[PDB]
Write a protein that binds this ligand. Structure first.
Ligand SMILES: Cc1cc(N2CC[C@@](CO)(C3CC3)C2=O)cc(C(=O)NCc2cc(F)cc(-c3cnn(C)c3)c2)n1
Ligand SMILES: Cc1cc(N2CC[C@@](CO)(C3CC3)C2=O)cc(C(=O)NCc2cc(F)cc(-c3cnn(C)c3)c2)n1
Ligand SMILES: O=C(C[C@H]1NCCC[C@@H]1O)Cn1cnc2ccccc2c1=O
Ligand SMILES: O=C(C[C@H]1NCCC[C@@H]1O)Cn1cnc2ccccc2c1=O
Ligand SMILES: [Ca+2]
Lengths: 466, 471
């Protein structure tokens, strides 16, 4: 079981939660972690969802080799690099494959692993040296088609997070300082970790435009015979989502997994003690499983002989199975069963004939409530502000600030440095742009930038970050 | 596609997989770009096999790709220790196995992963089939008994057989491997074997190992049984690769190009409207789109090729090289009569079908295609194996691009010296104007007479073993 409290030692809470749920296992080489099945299941679930969705958009999956903060092979010619990202590997193929408008749009995606070999200290799931992800890359005849694909993908990532992991996130555009180098515009979804006040980027959807197109000479001819440059997008998202899910829904007893990505939604734990009604208990469990699976609920019966009922309670609690269904001899005479829901503890006595509808209802209810609570904590962690004097208070309450900004990059860099210096004084760490939210709250006519006094351009979300 | 399969096989293969837009070539030779037309097949069998092993209790994971010294090696970020990239994951996993297994309560442990591996040999690569980087899955289990582990490897091998026969329509022989060719460090290796008739070679489709306890002993993977005695776990491993893809292509290709079994084809039915460039009015494409939704209701993977700059015949050739099994032609005369012309890629036969009749007939065809593609291949299999009885007969059968089913003593020095002699003899013929190893020892052992002798020593022959040249 898990000792530490989420809200006072967050770090050791997090690692107890991911280790004692058999999600992670540690490894020789720092910043690599073994992803055990209990996590891999969730990843498979979100993978299936995103893959179905992007296949509906006409994206096709592919595999490009891993050879081309970078890592280099030495011996067994030339040095070979391991892909940090595969722009450099894919785009020459793109330049060869595209020659006329009749070959656009071209939309490829790949699920693979990448290596980003930073020497700072890792955080499992969140900042690792090898992570699993997807990366998609499209080229279009026009910029407007490309942009709408950027936004369609960003909406998928919203769903990936909100709809599947019940994690609330913010759509926005990245500042010039923090956008992708040599992209034209970088959109993003951003999450919030309330326990340390930090923001974290959840996924990216870049509008590359034509910069790569000309570096790599990816060109096509329209219906006139004139060769134009293609407009490109790339986008991707990683196992970091799992981490953000954990930190969003964990409590002092361990994980809490939203039903939509839980591989076991209902665990049926039989109470056996002193050989009382063992055969009937086990029969009823198997019948309840049959019935619940007929309603497409994912059921496991923990009928393992070598474990105590109370051990099973705590085992599936810490693993975060959303619904536990206890069945013993009393309930055999009653035709009901006790169901405990992992997110609140509440118990219910449900009739067997009512299990399937009722359990479905409970599961929808759990998912929604995980999301709504989470969404609440997010919008209560966002302090809108007018002046820079209001920044450090909010930072110390572990919140983000939403302020008017003039949007020039020197603004951001000196804000970064100044807030890190102030942090170091108070300790005797920096605050950066998180994003420029799509949903722009009202901007009065005369409003001035919260740092420079210059005329404001847009509302911008700032805070400490990963 | 210009080259002719029966004549220049290697140039045939290269053209077939390049002009079908399966592979694209790359700087680093040994590593290829797998484009959608092929990766979809990989996705289809990946899903099949993954569903099947999940229902057996196997669960997926991901281990890292880096194993450290305590094979290709990576040095500079200046490194403290050269780290390698996994060629296989036994050494990355089995320490974790040692840590996670303590009691019989923890058994069985069944894991699996879908990853890429890197085996960096300096001999020349052949795409899909022998690459320096390839996608695979590798599964690793551990059991309390020996019989449990055995049962699981035979079950996995059955799954491999389906993967080849049921999905790719590629027939394969379930066999056991010589102790000379068996996994070093394994106790008994089982395999499925395939046969390329154009170069007469055998090839290892997938393998399923009975590792026994040797790895358990090396890594200290022990459990206490119910009586409290510390015991070694019995382990299995097993793997399959994108080589399946290669085997499939070769198995079914003809002079026009690929032929992809309907069960794994990304496009099962391609709809080619007959618009001879020019104006292109809405009347034709309209019907095609309706037909598409009509067909997708019945779960058919459909594509309309409406690219304006090409002639119907060009498209015909394009999709024939890509190997799509059914081609649906919709022209103005077809529109007038309310029908469509379907022609199967395998035999070239054409059918005129009403639109009502379109969904069932197509499905009845695809089955027909699937089945036929298999059984033809199966015969080309049985016609490649000659049941000889003395060593005198082997060179006439291997120069016939065959494999032979000879009775054998099962003595490993026999194997190594038959390899030596078949190369030598092989070389003299080459000079006048290659080695033959054992492929497997089959499970369907035919009748064995009392005191039949072996085909190379004269000793009492143990079992019928299948030999040929190979990859
Ligand atoms: C799992 C993952 C995801 C993403 N990102 C970035 C992109 C994005 C955004 O959503 C997604 C693709 C679109 C995502 O997931 C970035 C990293 C990462 O930079 N890893 C290297 C590393 C290793 C290490 F041990 C420590 C640190 C480190 C950095 N600062 N400090 C204080 C420590 C970094 N890793
Ligand atoms: C795709 C793939 C699959 C398998 N294996 C083996 C096992 C099996 C069988 O089912 C499956 C996993 C269990 C399978 O598919 C083995 C290789 C491979 O050894 N690659 C290295 C390489 C690169 C190269 F350029 C040349 C050569 C080479 C070797 N001899 N010559 C004349 C050239 C070898 N490659
Ligand atoms: O990876 C990206 C941008 C997009 N490229 C692939 C599609 C999704 C992805 O967000 C940003 N980035 C991040 N880190 C690096 C480290 C070394 C080399 C290149 C990079 C590098 O390019
Ligand atoms: O990979 C295997 C046996 C099984 N191990 C993983 C599951 C499926 C697979 O057949 C055999 N082999 C083959 N080639 C190597 C090259 C370098 C290092 C180790 C190996 C090595 O071990
Ligand atoms: Ca849109």
């Amino acid at each position: 079981m898990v000792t530490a409290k989420k809200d006072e030692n967050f770090s050791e809470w997090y690692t107890q939660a991911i280790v004692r749920s058999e999600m992670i296992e540690y490894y020789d080489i720092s910043g690599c972690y073994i992803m055990r099945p209990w996590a891999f299941h969730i990843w498979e679930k979100v993978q299936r969802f995103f893959d179905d969705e992007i296949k509906k958009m006409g994206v096709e999956n592919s595999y490009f080799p891993m050879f081309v903060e970078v890592a280099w092979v030495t011996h067994y010619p030339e040095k070979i690099a391991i892909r940090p990202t595969s722009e450099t590997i894919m785009y020459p193929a793109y330049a060869k494959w595209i020659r006329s408008h009749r070959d656009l749009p071209l939309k490829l995606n790949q699920w693979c692993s990448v290596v980003r070999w930073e020497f700072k200290q890792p955080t499992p799931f969140l900042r690792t040296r090898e992570f699993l992800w997807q990366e998609g890359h499209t080229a279009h005849a026009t910029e407007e088609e490309a942009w709408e694909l950027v936004l369609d993908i960003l909406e998928l990532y919203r769903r990936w997070y909100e709809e599947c992991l019940a994690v609330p996130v913010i759509k926005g555009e990245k500042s010039e300082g923090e956008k992708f180098a040599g992209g034209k515009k970088t959109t993003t979804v951003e999450a919030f970790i309330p326990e340390n006040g930090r923001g974290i980027q959840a996924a990216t959807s870049h509008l590359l435009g034509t910069n790569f197109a000309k570096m790599f000479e990816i060109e096509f001819e329209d219906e006139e015979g004139h060769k134009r440059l293609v407009h490109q997008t790339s986008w991707g998202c990683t196992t970091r989502s799992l981490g953000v899910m954990i930190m969003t829904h964990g409590d002092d007893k361990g994980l809490v997994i939203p039903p939509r990505v839980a591989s076991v939604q209902v665990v049926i734990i039989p109470i056996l003690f002193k050989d009382e009604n063992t055969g009937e208990i086990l029969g009823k469990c198997r019948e309840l499983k049959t019935m619940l699976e007929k309603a497409d609920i994912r059921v496991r019966i923990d009928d393992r002989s070598n474990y105590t009922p109370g051990w099973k309670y705590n085992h599936w609690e810490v693993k975060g199975v959303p619904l536990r269904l206890e069945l013993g001899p009393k309930d055999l005479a009653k035709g009901t069963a006790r169901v405990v829901r992992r997110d609140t503890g509440e118990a219910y006595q449900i009739s067997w004939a009512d299990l399937a509808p009722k359990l479905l209802e409970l599961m929808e209810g759990i998912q929604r409530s995980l999301f709504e609570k989470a969404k609440a904590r997010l919008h209560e962690g966002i302090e809108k502000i007018s002046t820079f004097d209001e920044v450090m208070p909010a930072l110390n309450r572990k919140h983000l600030v939403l302020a008017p900004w003039c949007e020039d990059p020197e603004s951001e860099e000196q804000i970064k440095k100044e807030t890190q210096k102030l942090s170091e004084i108070q300790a005797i760490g920096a605050m950066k742009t998180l994003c420029i939210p799509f949903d722009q709250p009202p901007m009065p006519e005369g409003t001035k930038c919260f740092y420079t006094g210059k005329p404001a351009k847009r509302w911008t979300l700032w805070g400490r970050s990963y």
